[model samples]
Target: CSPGIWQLDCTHLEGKVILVAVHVASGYIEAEVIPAETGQETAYFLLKLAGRWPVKTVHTDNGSNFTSTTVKTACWWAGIKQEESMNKELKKIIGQVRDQAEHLKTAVQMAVFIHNKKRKGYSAGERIVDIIATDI
Candidate 1:
């Protein structure tokens, strides 16, 4: 397990077709509004994302767009792992409501960029022991 923890999900965001990804360690986020929540769209996005970063395991929900063969094949070819989970911080940042003449795509990017910047000021907390003593 690497420090790279990615969480993603799909739903109607802003206008429609929103895909969100987060690098938990760095607090960096990536998102996109695709044409549809189809396997091809998801596969395309996953491939693009892999090119930019080193993917360890992708946290995703049971949605068809994620669980289908397209993403599975992409992950396999890219040597990335997969898991089941969902995260809503991305939508929460934008408050699930923002649509203007400008596409709003960059709007989402703008939100995440701030998050990454703000995270830089914060330092990591003390690490906890991996094993706790169990009293018999």
Candidate 2:
């Protein structure tokens, strides 16, 4: 799955639209598009949401946005192995377009809910809270 973007309009302001970035991996989200880029706050938010799931690796592009020291230091602190994908590889994984018309945001939310509930998938018949607290 790919990341989701949320366009928000500030009711108290005029013509101000903020783009929110979402981590599709586990529904982690960060708001505001100021600075026009991601930085230490983004890294910290992502890692905090990741909880105790010791990430063995991370995949991203060569963009300075992701290759910055903020992300690197956060990864080191979180004990996560980092892996940057080549240009071509990043393109292949990230894909070409994002479809918001399909209600992708809601769809993903519902799918994740279903996957965690009525579906029998990985760690089926087990408790997710326990799994996260113990196994992860």
Candidate 3:
């Protein structure tokens, strides 16, 4: 299992809702552009990615979609700890990225890519991408 938790949130763009997850330690992100902001849709994307990555705890805002029984139940069944909090940083990054592209999906993807490539730590070579590329 991964350490700490991943943050999950949703944002609106061009008549669509974009669901995003970010690894708190590495800043690695995964996103999906969906038609609606409902628990079923959120659960679907989370469950899909759960297969590709090791999910631990997931922190989300108290949106109706996230707080719904369906989403909560699914997370419980998946062995993912779930919590609620305001995701201001994620929302701010999404807003900045949303301004850069005309298309919603592309913009969000680009944002995730950019975020992952950002330099961190003491060494010049250190980046979130390096952390994400290695086993956690």
Q: Best to worst by lDDT, what's the order?
A: 3, 1, 2
Candidate 3 stretches greater than 4 Å from native: 1-4, 84-102, 121-136
Question: What does candidate 2's lDDT look like per residue over 22-77, in tens digits?
Answer: 23333332333233345665466447634644354554332354567887777677
Judge candidate 2 against the unseen true structure and give its global Cα lDDT, from 0 to 1: 0.39
Where is model 2 more than 4 Å wrong at Cα?
A: 1-37, 61-65, 84-111, 120-136
Candidate ranking under TM-score, highest first, comes to: 1, 3, 2
- Ranking 1 against 2 by lDDT, winner: 1
Clash count in backbone of candidate 3 = 0
* Worst window of 10 by summed lDDT in candidate 2: 4-13
lDDT values of the candidates?
0.63, 0.39, 0.68
Q: In angstroms, what RMSD does candidate 3 have relative to the true structure?
A: 4.4
- Residue 92's lDDT within candidate 3 is 59
Q: What does the lDDT come to for candidate 1? A: 0.63
